[PDB]
């Protein structure tokens with residue numbers, strides 16, 4: 001029960017996450033959505049993507065010393081959206097200029113020479129629909145590539161190729 | 172006009188479904204939703220579930236000669252809703268006194284003992300939530316067991332026990 | 343077999359009821375009978391009543407989104423009985439407790455400061471008699487006021503005084 | 514600042530309510546509010562309204578055999594809100610469909626041809642402002658009239674005209 005019509009998101013308690021310790025709230029409603037890629041290993045089953053989720057967070061919490069996984073939501077090629085910082089805890093995904101104003105969703109994999117399956121792309125768009133529904137994202141929300149906001153290779157040629165197809169993508 | 176937000180469903184093309192030969196339409200909106208199980212093998216990978224989808228559909232087409240798989244939607248333990256007949260077409264699943272007035276979603280597997288994993292229950296609760304959003308189901312919608320409308324074990328002793336706690340389950 | 347001899351009811355067809363989508367049945371013999379009133383306007387002709395019967399049902403199915411009018415029978419000042427859900431389908435007129443165990447007859451008017459015409463009382467008293475003969479009501483059924491089971495003013499002050507007089511009434 | 518800063522609710526002890534027998538729980542934040550009316554006599558002193566609260570309660574507890582007064586809150590024309598079963602206990606006020614997902618507030622009296630005093634209306638909204646401040650009511654909550662969800666004249670033509678004016682009033 002994470003309020004009406006939210007396209008099946010895996011809760012932290014399910015992917016065996018560690019307790020978040022982030023105190024910063026995000027000023028709703030949010031205008032931007034930054035799509036990125038973990039550039040880490042990819043997964044196609046929920047079982048493997050639960051393990052892969054943990055991997056991203058432990059690296060952010062134990063090693064990098066941040067309060068929680070830097071992303072608001074992680075997407076698996078298993079076609080499921082994983083909950084990280086969520087719609088309210090401000091993310092750590094695109095630097096100081098963008099972190100307090102945009103939501104950050106990342107695709108679990110390295111998408112330079114590899115494309116994400118339709119189910120994952122479907123789940124991401126479906127996640128943004130629930131966003132508007134909850135009142136976290138503005139009906140008029142703008143989707144920006146990670147390259148668009150920071151000098152980075154992410155989300156990867158192939159995935160950056162497809163998010164331009166997305167209707168809400170702004171130049 | 173009125174779809175607030177829906178949910179992610181695997182299209183027929185993706186699980187490689189045969190062409191539907193059905194033409195009878197369900198009068199819109201629908202008031203009843205019948206939950207049942209396929210009493211067959213379960214799956215937890217998006218790959219194997221797309222395959223399990225074909226099996227149920229082929230047994231219904233090539234062996235029982237029905238115009239398409241009997242259920243409107245299929246639910247996998249991979250946490251994904253698979254498209255069957257959909258929101259618009261009538262689908263043989265619980266008797267002629269009930270097939271013209273109800274949507275039929277079916278969990279893929281036999282849940283006499285075994286319970287469906289949380290993500291499967293989330294997939295179905297979200298599906299129904301999308302139904303209301305699309306206006307395919309009315310906000311009054313009543314969830315019913317397959318055993319509540321014809322003599323069968325169908326929902327599965329333990330899955331029947333679970334759907335009884337759902338907000339919309341009427342006597 | 344000993345022709346029950348009590349049918350003097352206007353059928354759904356005759357007063358032009360919209361189709362019922364209700365399918366949950368009562369178990370006969372039925373023990374209780376709950377008398378309520380519409381608190382709407384009253385009718386005294388078979389013509390004006392066929393209109394009122396339609397209105398109550400409309401307010402029930404179109405505004406509240408109910409499967410059909412909530413009462414089992416409606417009594418009019420025309421001296422005739424109107425079929426609602428009938429002797430078999432479970433009504434919606436007294437809550438989760440009584441609805442499964444009683445028939446809900448309702449006088450079509452506001453009897454807070456009025457008395458229903460003799461012919462209307464006769465049709466009511468008669469209806470119940472029909473009940474026993476068909477076997478839908480127990481030979482020793484219990485009549486009850488609507489306010490006896492719900493916090494309401496039904497069946498109206500003066501009419502409530504009338505039923506406490508009846509022989510099958512029970513505190 | 515921003516603490517609870519809630520209104521002033523007369524607690525049960527102060528109006529000497531009988532002990533609550535209820536155990537069912539509402540799951541906050543609540544989305545709906547159903548405005549009703551006791552349909553009885555009104556009051557304009559903290560002394561007479563405390564009296565009224567008891568009649569309504571006793572009738573609901575010993576006549577109908579309920580676990581506590583049906584409403585969550587009772588508004589008085591004295592300008593004071595009288596605590597019913599509160600913000601956390603499921604109340605009986607609008608059928609098995611709404612009771613679990615809504616809070617029940619009742620204006621003490623009958624308002625068919627009588628408008629409640631400004632006081633009452635302010636106390637009623639103060640309670641709603643309070644509700645959201647405590648996380649009891651969902652911020653984008655909705656207000657419906659009693660007649661909007663059940664066959665009844667309640668809350669009374671005039672009070673109904675008043676609540677249809679409110680923001681949060683929907684369909």
Ligand SMILES: CC(=O)N[C@@H]1[C@@H](O)[C@H](O[C@@H]2O[C@H](CO)[C@@H](O)[C@H](O)[C@H]2NC(C)=O)[C@@H](CO)O[C@H]1O
Pocket residue numbers: 037038039112151152153154
């Ligand atoms: C021209 C240049 O210097 N490019 C830099 C990138 O090589 C460098 O690596 C990218 O960093 C991402 C975030 O740390 C990695 O996830 C990603 O795998 C990596 N890109 C690739 C595909 O090699 C980024 C660091 O962000 O900075 C660029 O400036």
Ligand SMILES: CC(=O)N[C@@H]1[C@@H](O)[C@H](O[C@@H]2O[C@H](CO)[C@@H](O)[C@H](O)[C@H]2NC(C)=O)[C@@H](CO)O[C@H]1O
Pocket residue numbers: 209210211212223226227228230
């Ligand atoms: C090789 C294999 O795993 N076969 C699976 C079947 O055993 C399994 O059962 C069949 O399912 C139908 C639809 O649910 C049933 O109606 C049918 O009785 C049953 N087949 C029989 C005769 O046992 C199906 C599930 O569809 O999947 C196959 O993959």
